[PDB]
Amino acid sequence: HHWGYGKHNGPEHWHKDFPIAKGERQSPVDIDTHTAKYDPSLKPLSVSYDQATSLRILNNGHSFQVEFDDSQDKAVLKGGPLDGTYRLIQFHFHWGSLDGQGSEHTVDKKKYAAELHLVHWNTKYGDFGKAVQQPDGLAVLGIFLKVGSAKPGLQKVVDVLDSIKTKGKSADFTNFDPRGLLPESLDYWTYPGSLTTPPLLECVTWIVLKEPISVSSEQVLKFRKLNFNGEGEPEELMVDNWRPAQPLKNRQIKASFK
Numbered sequence: 001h002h003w004g005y006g007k008h009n010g011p012e013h014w015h016k017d018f019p020i021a022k023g024e025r026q027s028p029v030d031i032d033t034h035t036a037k038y039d040p041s042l043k044p045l046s047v048s049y050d051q052a053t054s055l056r057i058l059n060n061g062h063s064f065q066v067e068f069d070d071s072q073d074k075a076v077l078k079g080g081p082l083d084g085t086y087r088l089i090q091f092h093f094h095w096g097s098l099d100g101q102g103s104e105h106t107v108d109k110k111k112y113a114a115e116l117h118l119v120h121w122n123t124k125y126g127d128f129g130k131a132v133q134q135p136d137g138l139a140v141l142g143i144f145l146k147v148g149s150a151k152p153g154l155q156k157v158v159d160v161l162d163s164i165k166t167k168g169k170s171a172d173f174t175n176f177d178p179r180g181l182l183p184e185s186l187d188y189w190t191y192p193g194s195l196t197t198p199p200l201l202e203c204v205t206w207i208v209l210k211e212p213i214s215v216s217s218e219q220v221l222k223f224r225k226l227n228f229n230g231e232g233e234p235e236e237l238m239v240d241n242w243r244p245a246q247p248l249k250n251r252q253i254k255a256s257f258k
């Protein structure tokens with residue numbers, strides 16, 4: 001009886017195995033745009049993905065993830081609210097069964113069709129497993145997806161999903177350029193939070209971009225053909241793998257823009 005997103009093991013159950021689920025800096029949250037305050041102390045944000053080295057794509061049983069070589073400073077996030085250098089380890093998505101839901105963060109209670117998370121760890125802690133034990137160990141760049149025009153830079157991801165339909169399947173996924181998944185503007189909101197799945201560790205500086213990317217209905221439909229189950233098990237479509245907004249508690253969301 002492991003955690004997931006079903007009726008009997010979904011987000012409302014997670015606290016029993018992971019009591020930090022009810023903690024003081026849980027994610028995601030609703031971003032109330034009128035209350036977020038512009039912070040002119042924020043330094044410019046820096047997304048340096050030109051030397052990114054993608055390796056593999058994996059169906060992990062709750063989403064799919066594209067993994068990178070993080071054994072060197074090759075794809076890094078710096079600047080913004082961050083002190084130091086954070087290395088890209090993987091990206092993944094959360095999405096809905098219908099276009100009206102799927103994102104984890106919301107904006108004035110609006111849900112997007114999906115949300116991309118580019119996960120990075122602070123190089124001062126040496127490895128990802130040590131970084132997640134630190135309050136400033138991770139920086140996750142969140143990007144909303146809305147349904148409209150296709151995102152050309154996403155198509156290479158969508159076309160390999162057939163090959164990783166079920167839990168535990170992976171495929172070679174080299175030479176993928178994550179710059180093709182970014183919107184034009186790097187305007188963002190930032191706040192201190194957590195992993196949005198178990199173990200729910202409170203180790204993340206969240207940086208959520210204001211501008212969504214557009215993906216086509218066909219692209220998102222292919223996400224919804226994935227399976228939570230393993231091969232040869234009853235088919236359970238991988239949809240609605242998002243955690244709802246959590247209490248903001250004693251936090252302020254800051255904006256990089258006026």
Ligand SMILES: CCc1cc2c(cc1OS(N)(=O)=O)CC[C@@H]1[C@@H]2CC[C@]2(C)[C@@H](OS(N)(=O)=O)CC[C@@H]12
Nearest residue numbers: 092117118119128129132140194195196197198199
């Ligand atoms: C190093 C601690 C640890 C973290 C994570 C996992 C296993 C982990 O190891 S363990 N021993 O607890 O099973 C698998 C689930 C992973 C999580 C790191 C944070 C992850 C990438 C999440 O990223 S997110 N949504 O941006 O917070 C979604 C999947 C998460």
Ligand SMILES: [Zn+2]
Nearest residue numbers: 093094117196
């Ligand atoms: Zn995520």
